[PDB]
Design a protein around this ligand. Sequence first.
Ligand SMILES: *[C@@H]1O[C@H](CO)[C@@H](O[C@@H]2O[C@H](CO)[C@@H](O[C@@H]3O[C@H](CO[C@H]4O[C@H](CO[C@H]5O[C@H](CO)[C@@H](O)[C@H](O)[C@@H]5O)[C@@H](O)[C@H](O[C@H]5O[C@H](CO)[C@@H](O)[C@H](O)[C@@H]5O)[C@@H]4O)[C@@H](O)[C@H](O[C@H]4O[C@H](CO)[C@@H](O)[C@H](O)[C@@H]4O)[C@@H]3O)[C@H](O)[C@H]2NC(C)=O)[C@H](O)[C@H]1NC(C)=O
Ligand SMILES: *[C@@H]1O[C@H](CO)[C@@H](O[C@@H]2O[C@H](CO)[C@@H](O[C@@H]3O[C@H](CO)[C@@H](O)[C@H](O[C@H]4O[C@H](CO[C@H]5O[C@H](CO)[C@@H](O)[C@H](O)[C@@H]5O)[C@@H](O)[C@H](O)[C@@H]4O)[C@@H]3O)[C@H](O)[C@H]2NC(C)=O)[C@H](O)[C@H]1NC(C)=O
Ligand SMILES: *[C@@H]1O[C@H](CO)[C@@H](O[C@@H]2O[C@H](CO)[C@@H](O[C@@H]3O[C@H](CO)[C@@H](O)[C@H](O[C@H]4O[C@H](CO)[C@@H](O)[C@H](O)[C@@H]4O)[C@@H]3O)[C@H](O)[C@H]2NC(C)=O)[C@H](O)[C@H]1NC(C)=O
Ligand SMILES: *[C@@H]1O[C@H](CO[C@@H]2O[C@@H](C)[C@@H](O)[C@@H](O)[C@@H]2O)[C@@H](O[C@@H]2O[C@H](CO)[C@@H](O)[C@H](O)[C@H]2NC(C)=O)[C@H](O)[C@H]1NC(C)=O
Ligand SMILES: CC[C@@H](C(C)C)[C@@H](O)[C@H](O)[C@@H](C)[C@H]1CC[C@H]2[C@@H]3COC(=O)[C@@H]4C[C@H](O)[C@H](O)C[C@]4(C)[C@H]3CC[C@]12C
Ligand SMILES: *[C@@H]1O[C@H](CO)[C@@H](O[C@@H]2O[C@H](CO)[C@@H](O)[C@H](O)[C@H]2NC(C)=O)[C@H](O)[C@H]1NC(C)=O
Ligand SMILES: *[C@@H]1O[C@H](CO)[C@@H](O[C@@H]2O[C@H](CO)[C@@H](O)[C@H](O)[C@H]2NC(C)=O)[C@H](O)[C@H]1NC(C)=O
Ligand SMILES: *[C@@H]1O[C@H](CO)[C@@H](O[C@@H]2O[C@H](CO)[C@@H](O)[C@H](O)[C@H]2NC(C)=O)[C@H](O)[C@H]1NC(C)=O
Ligand SMILES: *[C@@H]1O[C@H](CO)[C@@H](O)[C@H](O)[C@H]1NC(C)=O
Ligand SMILES: *[C@@H]1O[C@H](CO)[C@@H](O)[C@H](O)[C@H]1NC(C)=O
Ligand SMILES: *[C@@H]1O[C@H](CO)[C@@H](O)[C@H](O)[C@H]1NC(C)=O
Ligand code: NA
Length: 743
Amino acid sequence: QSLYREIHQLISFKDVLPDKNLLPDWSSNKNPCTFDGVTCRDDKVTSIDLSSKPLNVGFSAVSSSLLSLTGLESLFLSNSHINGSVSGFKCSASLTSLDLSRNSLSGPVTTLTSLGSCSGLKFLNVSSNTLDFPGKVSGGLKLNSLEVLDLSANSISGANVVGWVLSDGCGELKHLAISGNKISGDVDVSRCVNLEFLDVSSNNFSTGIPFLGDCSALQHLDISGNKLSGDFSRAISTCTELKLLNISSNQFVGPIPPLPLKSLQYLSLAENKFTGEIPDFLSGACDTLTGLDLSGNHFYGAVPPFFGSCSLLESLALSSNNFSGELPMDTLLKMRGLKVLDLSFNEFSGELPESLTNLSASLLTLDLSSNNFSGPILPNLCQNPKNTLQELYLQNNGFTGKIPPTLSNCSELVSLHLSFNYLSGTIPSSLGSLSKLRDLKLWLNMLEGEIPQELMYVKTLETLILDFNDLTGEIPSGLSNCTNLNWISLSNNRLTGEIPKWIGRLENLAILKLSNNSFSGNIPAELGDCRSLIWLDLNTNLFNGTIPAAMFKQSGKIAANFIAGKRYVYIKNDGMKKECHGAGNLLEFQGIRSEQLNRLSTRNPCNITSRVYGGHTSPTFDNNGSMMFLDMSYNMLSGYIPKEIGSMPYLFILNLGHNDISGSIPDEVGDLRGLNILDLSSNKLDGRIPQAMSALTMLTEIDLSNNNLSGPIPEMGQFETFPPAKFLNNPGLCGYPLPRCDP
Ligand SMILES: *[C@@H]1O[C@H](CO)[C@@H](O[C@@H]2O[C@H](CO)[C@@H](O[C@@H]3O[C@H](CO[C@H]4O[C@H](CO[C@H]5O[C@H](CO)[C@@H](O)[C@H](O)[C@@H]5O)[C@@H](O)[C@H](O[C@H]5O[C@H](CO)[C@@H](O)[C@H](O)[C@@H]5O)[C@@H]4O)[C@@H](O)[C@H](O[C@H]4O[C@H](CO)[C@@H](O)[C@H](O)[C@@H]4O)[C@@H]3O)[C@H](O)[C@H]2NC(C)=O)[C@H](O)[C@H]1NC(C)=O
Ligand SMILES: *[C@@H]1O[C@H](CO)[C@@H](O[C@@H]2O[C@H](CO)[C@@H](O[C@@H]3O[C@H](CO)[C@@H](O)[C@H](O[C@H]4O[C@H](CO[C@H]5O[C@H](CO)[C@@H](O)[C@H](O)[C@@H]5O)[C@@H](O)[C@H](O)[C@@H]4O)[C@@H]3O)[C@H](O)[C@H]2NC(C)=O)[C@H](O)[C@H]1NC(C)=O
Ligand SMILES: *[C@@H]1O[C@H](CO)[C@@H](O[C@@H]2O[C@H](CO)[C@@H](O[C@@H]3O[C@H](CO)[C@@H](O)[C@H](O[C@H]4O[C@H](CO)[C@@H](O)[C@H](O)[C@@H]4O)[C@@H]3O)[C@H](O)[C@H]2NC(C)=O)[C@H](O)[C@H]1NC(C)=O
Ligand SMILES: *[C@@H]1O[C@H](CO[C@@H]2O[C@@H](C)[C@@H](O)[C@@H](O)[C@@H]2O)[C@@H](O[C@@H]2O[C@H](CO)[C@@H](O)[C@H](O)[C@H]2NC(C)=O)[C@H](O)[C@H]1NC(C)=O
Ligand SMILES: CC[C@@H](C(C)C)[C@@H](O)[C@H](O)[C@@H](C)[C@H]1CC[C@H]2[C@@H]3COC(=O)[C@@H]4C[C@H](O)[C@H](O)C[C@]4(C)[C@H]3CC[C@]12C
Ligand SMILES: *[C@@H]1O[C@H](CO)[C@@H](O[C@@H]2O[C@H](CO)[C@@H](O)[C@H](O)[C@H]2NC(C)=O)[C@H](O)[C@H]1NC(C)=O
Ligand SMILES: *[C@@H]1O[C@H](CO)[C@@H](O[C@@H]2O[C@H](CO)[C@@H](O)[C@H](O)[C@H]2NC(C)=O)[C@H](O)[C@H]1NC(C)=O
Ligand SMILES: *[C@@H]1O[C@H](CO)[C@@H](O[C@@H]2O[C@H](CO)[C@@H](O)[C@H](O)[C@H]2NC(C)=O)[C@H](O)[C@H]1NC(C)=O
Ligand SMILES: *[C@@H]1O[C@H](CO)[C@@H](O)[C@H](O)[C@H]1NC(C)=O
Ligand SMILES: *[C@@H]1O[C@H](CO)[C@@H](O)[C@H](O)[C@H]1NC(C)=O
Ligand SMILES: *[C@@H]1O[C@H](CO)[C@@H](O)[C@H](O)[C@H]1NC(C)=O
Ligand code: NA
């Protein structure tokens, strides 16, 4: 109250910070109403917001200094590096909202009961902390005066945790979120008659569907990301106010049951096992439906035409089912509000009706990937002015013809995916006018010609995927201006020339795959200036000279974060004929079926069956890392391997096989702790196998055959694991698994 007490409480909080300089304008002889982070009314402090400031202090400092302020109405400390746990404290009765999200609060969730000191508390957000529920679930939260409680993203593992929260009553509760825990058991919110928002998603619920009682107030129901399979239809039948219903990522089955459609705006049944065709009774929702997600089920049939009246539908996700027929334009154009259209991974056939060019001017995302669409790409597409299309996903179809340069009109285009098709012609230089294009993916086509240098104008280019084409020429110098590139893969073309030394300017460059081309010259030492390079595949080319030791200078300082989250497939080498080269083909694979990897048989000499790994890219570190994959096999590299080769603790494959490398294996190779595969076969390596290699503990595969090696095999680590074949054609070589070292 009194200004003297206000200032001293606040400054005592500042004086406890490890870095007092985080609150620079907080001074012991100014009015706190002038402080950054402070809100005042009539010269009295009412709210404090130090969110996203690394205060690095325990909750004891908060409760004793800030939460004791008389008249403080709200305290926001989201992502402030608060740790410790909530304990008893004297709480101003004016405090109504407390945001302690995204901190390091620990202890059992029963600690939050001590927040009952706050007689006026109505909003509590302790999400993204480490509260848990050890031992028995008993007692109660005893915060029944709350209107909004968010316990999401904690470490709460237990059954009937929800009952524990609401045990003491929930008449006042309007918004409950406990998502992202490991909670199970029953959800009984029938006594919470003013509950409008319920999010129990991403938990461990596998038994009863939540019981909603009269469901008088519920507008938002999210039970997705569990293992539910019960009769949710009966559970929500009385939910006349339900605006959002998310039951996706569960174990539900059967046809689409009855649903409350009066107020329904968002409906997701995605990632379940629902069957049948889209029922007609869903037309009742078209007065209000703004988003529909039926993706990832066993639906079939055409798109019912009642969807024509769904004029408010902004997103229509039907992907990964078995819908067939031609592109139902008769219905799509009536969807005046449609902004996202996802029919991917279906069996929609036919050519692209001309009327499709109209949707370009309203859609933001047109996803038709993985279907039976034939014919060419509409040249008249995007010819409608002020087009708004941002994502065009047509990959894995049967499109023929050329890439229409008119796609340059789609000025708002950020991602372009024409891969896995039969497109001929060249890459039009007009694509360089896409000032916002980030993803350009055109791999597995029949594109001839050179790469357009007009891409130097695309300063936002992030990925550049052009594998399996007939491209000739060199790497255009203009791409140096594409400094945001994090993925460039040009393999299986007929490219020539060298790797430009400006490759080291691309600090975001993480993956660089150039295999099965005719690149020449030495390895640029500037590849060591790449702060993000983690995947380097140069196999089957004409590189010569020696390996520069400088390319491994960024080891221990590599960052790999922008590259994470990208769908890929890794096709392990068949290990059969000498035709298949390299460890494996890392291939971009967004919106493509692995079943259609048979198309690679006409372009890749490898056996694909039982050798295709997939998923989303996930580097083994966030910072202070190194290179992960290094394959320069099938070239003409000479000289000796530099000792710096062993400075990559995250390298799990190293293939230098089929070259002209001389000298001995550096003992530093034994520092490659993470090495899974080590191929050095078909070279001129001489000397003994360094004993330090017996320290490699994760080698699932080695091959030192066809060299000039001699002496005993380390035979102290994993070398006995391997069959003789991996050591044959080394005359002087001996020791198990080879014949014993004799005179
Ligand atoms: C109906 O219910 C369903 C199911 O419950 C629900 O679907 C979930 O929706 C949420 C929110 O949309 C999803 O969670 C988010 O997923 C994001 C994607 O994570 C991937 O990509 C990350 C990189 O993102 C960047 O790059 C990618 C690729 O270049 C690009 O697409 C992105 O736009 C972006 O630029 C990547 O880091 C991540 O990998 C890490 O995380 C995953 C776990 O998610 C882990 O498995 C990996 O090992 C790795 O650690 C992954 O590949 C992601 O952006 C996002 O995270 C941000 O937001 C959260 C808060 O939402 C913050 O906590 C976080 O700090 C980030 O800011 C978040 O995780 C979720 O995956 C969906 N679940 C399913 C099953 O689909 C619907 O939304 C509901 N619908 C409604 C309510 O209408
Ligand atoms: C660098 O790129 C060029 C292309 O630019 C690659 O050369 C291509 O290689 C293709 C695959 O070898 C080849 O197509 C094949 O052609 C023959 C007839 O000529 C067909 O029989 C093949 O399809 C049929 O047979 C294969 C047989 O099995 C495959 O896998 C096993 C694995 O050991 C091998 O024995 C065999 O070599 C096959 O690869 C079946 O898988 C098929 O389903 C089908 O029944 C192929 O279509 C192209 O003609 C050829 N291109 C050129 C320009 O000559 C080149 O190999 C590549 N090099 C690399 C990556 O190192
Ligand atoms: C309790 O605190 C947590 C932690 O702050 C809080 O969760 C956070 O909520 C915000 C807001 O919803 C999330 O950020 C959103 O993320 C999604 C996906 O990227 C977007 O839809 C949102 O965009 C909105 O904001 C943009 C910027 O203004 C707008 O351009 C856009 O139109 C949208 O309005 C938004 O960025 C954030 O990710 C979470 N954080 C975590 C860690 O989950 C939670 O809401 C709080 N609980 C309560 C009950 O208030
Ligand atoms: C790496 O190769 C380049 C390109 O030339 C190839 O390799 C040569 C050794 C020879 O076999 C050529 O027919 C190949 O096309 C080399 O540049 C060549 O340098 C050599 C040696 O002085 C010379 O005879 C050629 O004329 C050069 N070619 C050109 C186009 O200027 C380069 O020197 C090779 N690097 C090493 C370390 O040998
Ligand atoms: C590719 C995308 C990555 C990004 C980060 C670039 C990342 O997302 C991946 O997870 C990557 C690091 C995976 C996919 C394929 C896996 C292969 C499988 O094939 C084998 O069998 C190999 C031989 C042997 O079995 C060995 O033990 C396992 C081997 C080497 C693994 C290694 C790890 C993977 C490479
Ligand atoms: C998710 O729920 C399942 C099922 O309730 C849990 O598995 C049970 O674990 C207990 C404790 O060990 C066992 O007594 C049961 O036999 C298990 N049941 C089954 C069907 O396996 C599982 O542990 C939960 N997971 C988490 C992360 O909480
Ligand atoms: C998915 O749909 C396809 C396409 O309809 C089904 O395969 C057959 O398709 C032909 C038309 O080309 C129909 O005459 C047949 O009746 C379809 N078969 C059956 C059994 O319905 C395919 O079976 C469907 N299922 C899956 C899992 O893809
Ligand atoms: C690719 O590998 C698969 C196995 O992953 C091979 O499958 C063989 O199939 C033939 C008949 O076509 C059988 O005689 C073999 O016994 C199978 N081998 C297995 C299952 O290991 C397939 O032949 C390989 N393809 C090529 C071209 O070599
Ligand atoms: C909170 O973080 C500080 C700063 O690292 C640390 O010294 C302290 O031990 C932490 N407190 C608890 C209770 O873990
Ligand atoms: C459509 O392509 C799928 C594979 O993506 C195939 O199973 C199906 O038979 C094809 N349909 C027609 C009519 O060609
Ligand atoms: C390309 O980068 C060079 C300098 O490396 C610069 O002179 C040139 O103007 C850049 N191009 C564009 C279009 O900005
Ligand atoms: Na081109």
